[PDB]
């Protein structure tokens, strides 16, 4: 439905040089559904009118030559009547003896005396003046005019607006018409500095454009949003008023579901709380849906919609509705004589992200409210010191931020360093190790984080006291101390213990015999190196981690933008510029304008500090949790279940992030299992026997004993067994014999 | 109930309920045979509770 002067038809309301900024303006523009045919006079002449042409194609002309017409085909109104000498013109509603049929040859001022060169015109009779705009490019094909995105740049003009007739952008040099179908709404512009810019956007082509204008942006991200509430149409009033029961009509929001813009552009619509009987159709409990079907196959939730149903871009991919799916089912065989045992293990690496703090700001109440006016001050002083107490509270929270930062990152007394030799028993720790070769002293993963992660009206920002450099110094010192001394240095003086028996201690901490590590050293080292490599690749690939920090950053930016914007409103005042205010209109209604200003900033800056204060509460709880995790899972080993990663924790290293922290958890996971059989007790010499540790199992023809986390059969002796009671009371004992370890020494 | 605490961090492994209870009792610091020598009374107490 697009056939062009292209998305021109946005004329420029004034010369105000907005530059590289968003602004939507409501003005007089032209509606939808402009179609027309070609006829006889018993292929585009004068169009359905306004000032020029329509919305999509290409051309370049050198064509037009002649004229005898009126622009409205009347010439009583403003014709294209050229007695206009190109420096002085004549335009005649000026009443002269009109001929009802024009001709050709071989007071109505421009000097002031009686177009694909897309010079717009002026007959906008706001109190009677005349003028012209100007831009240029031509017509040699179906319709055209060119592309960009904004209005142009200002040099000289005298603007009042237009009334000519053929909707614009015009047609000239460098039967019935045809035009297309255009929706009129606001028009967003972005005036780049160099001025290579033409276009705009509308808001109600479809719910896509509705979201585009509602969010005041262009790159609509995948998700779900709600636009202006759809009042259920009250065609007529209610018959209840004077001169069996009646219930008022319902209403509800109109919701839009869409994938990413670059992904696709097809869009569906959701109606909230409405009944389709009372308004493709997909009747559901939630309401009416288009494009979705009851589909037998199911998935987990990807784009949540509500009410226990989730939708996704699915079969290619399209907006469909499916019932929730939790996961696969499973069951196990439990018997009085059944048991399972693992045989192999593996090493895993996980991450974790937490926020640490937020930026600090300040506001100068007196100048922000007064504009530095002596009259404003000597009127305003009658109220009180509320702004000063606000500044006091703001300063308190500002210092509390740095207090929290110091508390979390002040847990070390002495700094350390690593020996020049990096012989660490095959382990390659160079990945998380800082590199002096870089201009900074950060590890490559920290550097990757730093690259991946990327006002004057009394507003001030306070820099913090701690720098990235010595924060990195603290982190490096902590890592070096951890690797060099284990957990001993967290309780007293530094003691040196090597890595192999360090990990032997860690394994023994979770009930694992230490010889396993010595007998699997190369395998464990290779698994660890591969895990480190894969976590490098995973963090280099997935970009969805930084959402938590981006959220708070955008939140503070949005709050600042809102509070800055709210100043420019009038709140009923005739003007918003204080100088013109006190020059012309006094403070009977400038006292109410300063009253509404001070109360509107009471809500908006008490809420600046109030949502920033609830944010401080959240960030303080976060800092407390972060410090707890620091101390518990970095300076020692935690027996808590799933407090730090999933599995059995072994190691932990912290990493620094802007206003955040990064953790790596190294856990242990069993891999391979086998079936076995077990019994409670054995009765060899009429006397009960119990295992000192582990459990009794059988391969079918023999009996052994082994621990509970690794399979290693052993011969049953008295070293790992003890005697308690006879064999009658217990249930399930076996008539097996225990080998006596003293006899093969006695006989020798 | 089927797999104790085993499934909390890996693949579930079947294990008898009395053996799981014996593991718990050893966890608290009591020798396991006490459970075996009184399991009937313990079950009666548990049902009553």
| CA–CA dist A116, A177 (Å, integer) | 16
> What is the residue-wise DSSP string for A701-726?
S-EEEE-SSS-------SSSEEEEEE
Structure tokens, A523? 């395998």
Q: How far is CA A646 from CA A506, A528, A641, in A?
A: 16, 16, 8
Cβ(A653)–Cβ(A481) below 8 Å = no
Structure tokens, A361? 């700001």
Cβ(A453)–Cβ(A657) below 8 Å = yes
Taking each helix axis as running N to C, give the angle between helix A547-566 and helix A591-634, from 0 to 180 degrees, rounded to the nearest 10.
170
The answer for residues whose C-beta is within 8 angstroms of residue A737's C-beta and 6 or more apart is: A684
HSE-up of residue A247 (Cα within 13 Å, Cβ side):
2
Please tell me what DSSP assigns to residue A739.
P
> What is the residue-wise DSSP string for A484-546?
HHTTGGGTSS-----HHHHHHHHHHTTT--THHHHTSHHHHHHHHHHHHHHHHHHHHH---TT
Q: How far is CA A306 from CA A267, A278, A279, A462, A605, in A?
A: 18, 22, 21, 43, 35
| CA–CA dist A358, A461 (Å, integer) | 12
The answer for residues whose C-beta is within 8 angstroms of residue A337's C-beta and 6 or more apart is: A677, A678, A679, B16
Work out the number of other CB atoms within 10 angstroms of the CB of residue A359: 16
Cα angle for residues A473, A475, A481 (degrees, 5° grid): 100
Cβ(A339)–Cβ(A697) below 8 Å = yes
Q: Do A681 and B9 touch (CB under 8 A)?
A: no
> What residues in B contact A667, CB-CB < 8 Å?
9
Work out the number of other CB atoms within 10 angstroms of the CB of residue A517: 18
The residues of B whose Cβ lies within 8 A of any Cβ of A are: 2-3, 5, 8-16, 18-19, 31-33, 36-37, 39
Cβ(A174)–Cβ(A4) below 8 Å = no
HSE-up of residue A651 (Cα within 13 Å, Cβ side):
16
| CA–CA dist A466, A469 (Å, integer) | 8
Q: Residue B16 burial by CB count (10 A; 0-12/13-18/19+): exposed, middle or buried? A: middle
| CA–CA dist A279, A718 (Å, integer) | 84
- Find, in chain B, the residue whose alpha carbon is nearest to that of A679: B19
Cβ(A150)–Cβ(A190) below 8 Å = yes
The answer for residues whose C-beta is within 8 angstroms of residue A696's C-beta and 6 or more apart is: A678, A679, A680, A681, A682, A703, A704, A705, A716
Parallel, antiparallel or unpaired: strands A695-698 and A648-657: unpaired
What b/e sequence results for A440-467 when a residue is b if at least 16 CB atoms lie within 10 Å of its CB, and e otherwise?
eebbebbeebbeeeeeeeeeeeeeeeee
Work out the number of other CB atoms within 10 angstroms of the CB of residue A52: 25
Q: Residue A480 burial by CB count (10 A; 0-12/13-18/19+): exposed, middle or buried? A: middle
Q: How far is CA A717 from CA A676, A732, B31, in A?
A: 21, 20, 19
Method: cryo-EM
Query: How many angstroms from the chain centroid is the CA of residue A460?
Result: 26
| CA–CA dist A692, A679 (Å, integer) | 15
Collapsing DSSP states into helix, strand and coil, what is residue A320?
strand
HSE-up of residue A304 (Cα within 13 Å, Cβ side):
3
Query: How many angstroms from the chain centroid is the CA of residue A244?
Result: 52
Residue whose C-alpha is closest to residue A563's, from A610, A526, A493:
A610
**For testing contact with chain A, the best of B14, B17, B30, B35 (most A CBs within 10 A):** B14
Cβ(A320)–Cβ(A309) below 8 Å = no
Q: Do A670 and B10 touch (CB under 8 A)?
A: yes
Collapsing DSSP states into helix, strand and coil, what is residue A146?
coil
| CA–CA dist A534, A529 (Å, integer) | 9
Q: Do A646 and B9 touch (CB under 8 A)?
A: yes
Sign of the alpha-carbon dihedral angle for A697, A702, A703, A705:
negative
Cβ(A169)–Cβ(A9) below 8 Å = yes
**What are φ and ψ of residue A584, in 5° steps?**
-110, -55
| CA–CA dist A153, A15 (Å, integer) | 8
Residue whose C-alpha is closest to residue A351's, from A718, A664, A16:
A664
| Element at A459 (helix H, strand E) | strand A459-461
Q: Residue A571 burial by CB count (10 A; 0-12/13-18/19+): exposed, middle or buried? A: middle
| CA–CA dist A371, A603 (Å, integer) | 20
Q: Do A333 and B12 touch (CB under 8 A)?
A: no
Q: How far is CA A424 from CA A233, A410, A429, A519, A637, in A?
A: 75, 29, 8, 18, 22
- How far is the first Cα of chain A from the last one, in angstroms, to the nearest whole number? 105
Work out the number of other CB atoms within 10 angstroms of the CB of residue A109: 13
Sheet with strand A268-271: strands edge to edge: A223-226, A254-258, A268-271, A288-289, A282-283
Q: Residue A311 burial by CB count (10 A; 0-12/13-18/19+): exposed, middle or buried? A: buried
Minimal Cα–Cα distance from B47 to chain A, Å? 20
Nearest beta carbon to residue A648 from set B3, B9, B33: B9
> What residues in A contact B36, CB-CB < 8 Å?
680-681, 729-731
> What residues in B contact A678, CB-CB < 8 Å?
19
The answer for residues whose C-beta is within 8 angstroms of residue A522's C-beta and 6 or more apart is: A426
Cα angle for residues A418, A421, A425 (degrees, 5° grid): 95
Please tell me what DSSP assigns to residue A734.
B
Parallel, antiparallel or unpaired: strands A673-678 and A339-342: antiparallel
Q: How far is CA A604 from CA A130, A407, A610, A615, in A?
A: 45, 31, 9, 16
| CA–CA dist A474, A470 (Å, integer) | 6
Cβ(A433)–Cβ(A443) below 8 Å = yes
Query: How many angstroms from the chain centroid is the CA of residue A29?
Result: 34
Cβ(A490)–Cβ(A636) below 8 Å = yes
CA-based R_g, chain A, Å: 40
Nearest beta carbon to residue B9 from set A341, A647, A673: A647
Q: In three state form, how does the secondary structure of B8-49 look?
A: HCCCCCCCCHHHHHHHHHHHHCCCCHHHHHCHHHHHHHHHHC
Q: Which residues pair with A122 in a beta bridge?
A: A131
Work out the number of other CB atoms within 10 angstroms of the CB of residue A33: 9
Q: How far is CA A321 from CA A270, A291, A723, in A?
A: 11, 8, 66
Structure tokens, A256? 């839009």
The answer for residues whose C-beta is within 8 angstroms of residue A603's C-beta and 6 or more apart is: none
What b/e sequence results for A604-624 when a residue is b if at least 16 CB atoms lie within 10 Å of its CB, and e otherwise?
ebebbbeebeebbeebbebbe
> What is the residue-wise DSSP string for A604-657?
HHHHHHHHHHHHHHHHHHHHHHHHHHHHHHHSS---STTSSSSSEEEEEEEEEE
Size of interface A-B (CB pairs under 8 A): 61
Structure tokens, A37? 């045919």
Collapsing DSSP states into helix, strand and coil, what is residue A132?
strand
Cβ(A139)–Cβ(A59) below 8 Å = yes
């Amino acid at each position: 439905a697009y056939t062009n002067s292209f998305t021109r038809g946005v004329y420029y309301p004034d010369k105000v040089f907005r530059s590289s900024v968003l602004h939507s303006t409501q003005d007089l523009f032209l509606p939808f559904f402009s179609n027309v045919t070609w006829f006889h006079a018993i292929d585009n002449p004068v169009l359905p009118f306004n000032d020029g042409v329509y919305f999509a194609s290409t051309e370049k002309s050198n064509i037009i030559r002649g004229w005898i017409f009126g622009t409205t085909l009347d010439s009583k109104t403003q014709s294209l009547l050229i007695v206009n000498n190109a420096t002085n013109v004549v335009i005649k509603v000026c009443e002269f003896q009109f001929c009802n049929d024009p001709f050709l040859g071989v007071n109505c001022t421009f000097e002031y005396v009686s177009f694909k060169n897309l010079r717009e015109f002026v007959f906008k009779n706001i109190d009677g003046y005349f003028k012209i705009y100007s831009k240029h490019t031509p017509i040699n094909l179906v319709r055209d005019l060119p592309q960009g995105f904004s209005a142009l740049e200002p040099l000289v003009d005298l603007p009042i607006g237009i009334n000519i007739t053929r909707f614009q952008t015009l047609l000239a040099l460098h039967a019935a018409y045809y035009v297309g179908y255009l929706q009129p709404r606001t028009f967003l512009l972005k005036y780049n500095e160099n001025g290579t810019i033409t276009d705009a956007v509308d808001c109600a082509l479809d719910p896509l454009s509705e979201t585009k204008c509602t969010l005041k942006s262009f790159t609509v991200e995948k998700g779900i949003y709600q636009t202006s509430n759809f009042r259920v149409q009250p065609t007529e009033s209610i018959v209840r008023f004077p001169n069996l029961d009646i219930t008022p009509c319902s209403f509800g929001g109109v919701s839009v579901i869409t994938p990413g813009t670059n992904t696709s552009n097809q869009v569906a619509v959701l109606y909230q709380g409405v009944n389709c009987t009372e308004v493709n159709v997909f009747q559901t409990r939630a309401g009416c849906l288009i494009g979705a079907e009851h589909v037998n196959n199911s998935y987990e939730c990807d784009i949540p919609i509500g009410a226990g149903i989730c939708a996704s871009y699915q079969t290619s991919q399209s907006i469909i509705a499916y019932t929730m799916s939790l996961g696969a089912e499973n069951s196990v065989a439990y018997s009085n004589n059944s048991i399972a045992i693992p045989t192999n293990f593996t090493i895993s690496v996980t991450t974790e992200i937490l926020p640490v703090s937020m930026t600090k700001t300040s506001v100068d109440c007196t100048m922000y409210i007064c504009g530095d006016s002596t009259e404003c001050s000597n009127l305003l002083l009658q109220y009180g010191s509320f702004c000063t107490q606000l500044n006091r509270a703001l300063t308190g929270i500002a210092v509390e931020q740095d207090k929290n930062t110091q508390e979390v990152f002040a847990q070390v007394k002495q700094i350390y360093k690593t020996p020049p030799i990096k012989d660490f028993g095959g382990f390659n720790f160079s990945q998380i190790l800082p590199d002096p070769s870089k201009p900074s002293k950060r590890s490559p993963i920290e550097d990757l984080l730093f690259n991946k992660v990327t006002k004057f009206n009394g507003l001030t920002v306070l820099p913090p006291l701690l720098t990235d450099e010595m924060i990195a110094q603290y982190t490096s010192a902590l890592l070096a101390g951890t690797i060099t001394s284990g957990w001993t240095f967290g309780a007293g003086p530094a003691l040196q213990i090597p890595f192999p028996m360090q990990m032997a201690y860690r394994f023994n901490g979770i009930g694992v015999t230490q010889n396993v590590l010595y007998e699997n050293q190369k395998l464990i080292a290779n698994q660890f190196n591969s895990a480190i490599g894969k976590i490098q690749d995973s963090l280099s690939s997935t970009p969805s981690a930084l959402g938590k920090l981006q959220d708070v950053v955008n939140q503070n930016a949005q709050a600042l933008n809102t509070l800055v914007k709210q100043l420019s409103s009038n709140f009923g005042a005739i003007s918003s510029v204080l100088n013109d205010i006190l020059s012309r209109l006094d403070p009977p209604e400038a006292e109410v304008q300063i009253d509404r200003l001070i109360t509107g900033r009471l809500q908006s800056l008490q809420t600046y500090v109030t949502q920033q204060l609830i944010r401080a509460a959240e960030i303080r709880a976060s800092a407390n949790l972060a410090a707890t995790k620091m101390s518990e899972c970095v300076l020692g080993q935690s027996k808590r279940v799933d407090f730090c990663g999933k599995g059995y924790h072994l190691m932990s290293f912290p990493q620094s992030a802007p206003h955040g922290v990064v953790f790596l958890h190294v856990t242990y996971v069993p891999a391979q299992e086998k079936n076995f059989t077990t019994a409670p007790a054995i009765c060899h010499d009429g006397k009960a026997h119990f295992p000192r540790e582990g459990v009794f199992v059988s391969n079918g023809t023999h009996w052994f004993v082994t621990q509970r986390n690794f399979y290693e059969p052993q011969i049953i002796t008295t070293d790992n067994t003890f005697v308690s009671g006879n064999c009658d009371v217990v249930i399930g004992i076996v008539n097996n014999t225990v080998y006596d370890p003293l006899q093969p020494e006695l006989d020798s």
